[PDB]
Structure 1
Amino acid sequence: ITGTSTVGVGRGVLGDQKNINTTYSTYYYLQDNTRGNGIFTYDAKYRTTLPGSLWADADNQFFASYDAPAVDAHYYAGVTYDYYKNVHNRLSYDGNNAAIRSSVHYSQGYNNAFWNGSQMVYGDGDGQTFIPLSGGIDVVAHELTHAVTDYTAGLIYQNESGAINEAISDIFGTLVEFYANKNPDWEIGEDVYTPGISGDSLRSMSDPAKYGDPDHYSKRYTGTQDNGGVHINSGIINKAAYLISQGGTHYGVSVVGIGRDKLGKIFYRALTQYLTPTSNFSQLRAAAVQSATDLYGSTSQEVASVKQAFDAVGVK
């Protein structure tokens, strides 16, 4: 809508207070005009019809419990936009400041979130397995990263290329979590998963096998579930990325860590410059080595650590 930019205040899913960019025109709308062509948050009103109604509020205060998922979807979309702009010089997901749209309150008791090809969508969860999914910044950044991947490499959502697609979203979801820097970790979804059980998460990058996911190529899933295991075999790549950053010895192979910032730079370059829709794990390794070479030289520690990380997980 057309109106006056302003700043409102609200409470997110976890009860934390934050400021949000809104637009005023009779009502106050969740429309942030300060980032590219805008960030827009919609109410799907417990239906599956999308996008729903652009979120309108009478007083620019968002403290009602119904408000919380919208506050967080709106605010964390902004953080993610800032991460891509400030760190990788990328303007929104298409690189040309496309408007970012999110809908919340999708369906009833819906235990997931997703990018549908044009916007992000967030369920409220059933209160048992999940609380509203926009409450996790790693979850928001994961979904928005699918949009980035679709506009760049275009990795098909099947088999190895699909597992790479998933790992990239987990990797950048985590890097964005570290960017915002409130209790960052190498786990996925811990803020919104199983409110009744502390210390768990949906996936682990530091130790995928904790939840039964493979951490070595020899343990890859070869069946047909989950589109050929796109959320399962991602653990192999997530472990590689964790090792490149933090270091460690894994199946007897030692890796010198080079830290998060270099991990992000290498993987972003691989994504945007070298990966293609049908890239497999071996092609990821080659793309990552070539990226690190481009940035730091063929005889760098950086190139060395990428090679050892991929050897450690069994990807040749």
Structure 2
Amino acid sequence: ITGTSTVGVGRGVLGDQKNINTTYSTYYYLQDNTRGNGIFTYDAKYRTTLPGSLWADADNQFFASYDAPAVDAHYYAGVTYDYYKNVHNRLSYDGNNAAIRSSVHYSQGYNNAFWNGSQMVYGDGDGQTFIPLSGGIDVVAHELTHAVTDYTAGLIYQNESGAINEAISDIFGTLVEFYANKNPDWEIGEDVYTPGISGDSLRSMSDPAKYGDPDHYSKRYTGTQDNGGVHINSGIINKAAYLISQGGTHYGVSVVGIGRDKLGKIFYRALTQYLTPTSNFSQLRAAAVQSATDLYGSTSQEVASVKQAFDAVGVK
């Protein structure tokens, strides 16, 4: 909407206070004009029609329990926008400052979040498996990264290309979490997953097997569930990414870590310059080796480490 840019204040899902960019025109709307062509957050009102209504508030204060998922969707979209712009010189998901839209309070007891081809969508969870999913910065960045992938490599959402698609979202979700620097880790969704159980998460990049996800190509799932295991086989690539950044010895193969910033540069270049809609794991290895070669040189430690990491997870 047309209005004047303002700054509201509220509390997120975990009870933390934060400032949010809003727009005033009769009401205060969750419309952040400070980033690209805007970040817009909508209320789906427990229904499934999208996007719903642009979030409107009478007083620019967002401290109601019902407000919390909107506060976090809006704020963490901003953080993710900043990450891509400041770190990768990418302006929004399309590279041309496309408006970023999110809807919260989607459906009832909805234990998931997704990119629907045009916008991000967040369930509130059922209070047992999840609390409102926008409370996780890694989750928000995971979802916006699906949009980045769709506008770039275009990895088809099934089988190996789909597992790469998933891993790319977990990787950048995690790198954004580190960028914001609040309780960062290599786990996925820990902030909003199972409020009754401490210390767990939906997936782990450092040890995917803790939740029965594969950490070696020999253990890949080849059935039909979950689009051919896109959220399962992502473990193989997530493990490789973790090893590239942090190092380690995995099934006897030692990897020299090169750090998160270089992981991010290598995988962003692979995603945007080399991967295609049908890339498989072997092709991702080649893309990452080439990307590291472009950035650091053929004889670099960085190139050697990428190779070590893919060797370690059994991808040739």
Task: Using structure 2 for the length normalisation, give the TM-score.
Answer: 1.00
CA shift digits 1:119-176 (9 cap, x unpaired): 0000000011100000000000000000000000000001000000000000000000
Report 1:75-90 matches (<5 A). 75-90=75-90
Distance in 2 (alpha carbons) for counterparts of 1:287 and 1:149:
15
Classify the secondary structure of the residue corresponding to 1:262. Answer: helix
Classify the secondary structure of the residue corresponding to 1:71. Answer: helix
Classify the secondary structure of the residue corresponding to 1:67. Answer: helix
Distance in 2 (alpha carbons) for counterparts of 1:77 and 1:19:
13
Classify the secondary structure of the residue corresponding to 1:126. Answer: coil
How much does 1:264 deviate? 0.1
Superposition RMSD in Å: 0.3
How much does 1:262 deviate? 0.1
Distance in 1 (alpha carbons) for counterparts of 2:222 and 2:70:
38
Unaligned stretches of 5+ in structure 1? none
Classify the secondary structure of the residue corresponding to 1:154. Answer: coil
Distance in 1 (alpha carbons) for counterparts of 2:246 and 2:60:
42
How much does 1:104 deviate? 0.3
Q: What percent of counterpart residues are identical?
A: 100
CA shift digits 1:19-42 (9 cap, x unpaired): 000000000000000000000000
Report 1:1-316 matches (<5 A). 1-316=1-316
CA shift digits 1:203-259 (9 cap, x unpaired): 000000000000000000011100100000000000000000000000000000000
How much does 1:77 deviate? 0.2
Aligned residues: 316
CA shift digits 1:257-315 (9 cap, x unpaired): 00000000000000000000000000000000000000000000000000000000000
Classify the secondary structure of the residue corresponding to 1:102. Answer: strand
How much does 1:194 deviate? 0.2
Distance in 2 (alpha carbons) for counterparts of 1:29 and 1:59:
10
Distance in 1 (alpha carbons) for counterparts of 2:222 and 2:162:
13
Distance in 2 (alpha carbons) for counterparts of 1:313 and 1:130:
30
Classify the secondary structure of the residue corresponding to 1:177. Answer: helix
Classify the secondary structure of the residue corresponding to 2:128. Answer: coil
How much does 1:78 deviate? 0.2
Unaligned stretches of 5+ in structure 2? none
Distance in 1 (alpha carbons) for counterparts of 2:107 and 2:215:
34
How much does 1:17 deviate? 0.1
CA shift digits 1:100-120 (9 cap, x unpaired): 000000000101000000000
Distance in 2 (alpha carbons) for counterparts of 1:66 and 1:264:
35
How much does 1:75 deviate? 0.2
How much does 1:184 deviate? 0.1
Classify the secondary structure of the residue corresponding to 1:121. Answer: strand
Distance in 1 (alpha carbons) for counterparts of 2:201 and 2:8:
31
Distance in 1 (alpha carbons) for counterparts of 2:37 and 2:49:
24
Distance in 2 (alpha carbons) for counterparts of 1:45 and 1:98:
25
Distance in 1 (alpha carbons) for counterparts of 2:66 and 2:223:
40
How much does 1:88 deviate? 0.1
Which portions of structure 1, spanning 4 or more consecutive aligned residues, are displaced by more than 2 angstroms?
Answer: none
Distance in 1 (alpha carbons) for counterparts of 2:267 and 2:303:
12
Distance in 2 (alpha carbons) for counterparts of 1:225 and 1:46:
28
How much does 1:54 deviate? 0.2
Task: Using structure 1 for the length normalisation, give the TM-score.
Answer: 1.00
